[PDB]
């Protein structure tokens, strides 16, 4: 997981 603009996604 990685976080963009405060949400964790794949």
């Amino acid at each position, epitope marked *: *997981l990685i*976080n*963009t*603009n*405060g*949400s*964790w*996604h*794949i």
Partner: antibody
Amino acid sequence: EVQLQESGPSLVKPSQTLSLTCSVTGDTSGYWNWIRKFPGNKLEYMGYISYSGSTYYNLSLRSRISITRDTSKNQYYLQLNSVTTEDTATYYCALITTTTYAMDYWGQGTSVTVSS
Amino acid sequence: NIVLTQSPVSLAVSLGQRATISCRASESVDGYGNSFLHWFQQKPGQPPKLLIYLASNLNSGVPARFSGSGSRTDFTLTIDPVEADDAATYYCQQNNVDPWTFGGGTKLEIKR
């Protein structure tokens, strides 16, 4: 045993920039964060700069905030412009790893007062 | 925006009892089969220390007396048994929805 430690002036004047530094000792891996606690004890999440150089800021501050790093002084930086008295707080730096996806390790925090 | 509501604000427990703390999100904090809800303990002059991460995994270095659960929007922390060491404020903290926020905290008093 990563250790983090905030430093910077403890007094800033209204309308100026507050600048703080967080030195990391004991290890481009994860998310490097700033958080503060108001004098009445509530905590607010300020932002990070990830391993990639990417940033994420609380939208309630996104206009005045800047977090940067220098990966070869092993240091990272908070800059908050146009401060008022509502910006008085103990400032923390803390890290997030993917081991936990949580603010795992924390500095002792440093106190900053906006006042003339 | 998303608010985390902690209840009670304060709560008193005897030396050996069970403490139970409530965190409610105004909207979900779940993603990819996980809960981005975290719990911290804060003593004065000290920063928050991690207790539970991802809703119910107990942080390394932390006594198995600590545990928590919940999902989606409704989360709780339980200390069992209580020790004197646990006189402190307790926060929940969500890091999967813009803005990241903390609960307004719960303070534990120990009875003696």
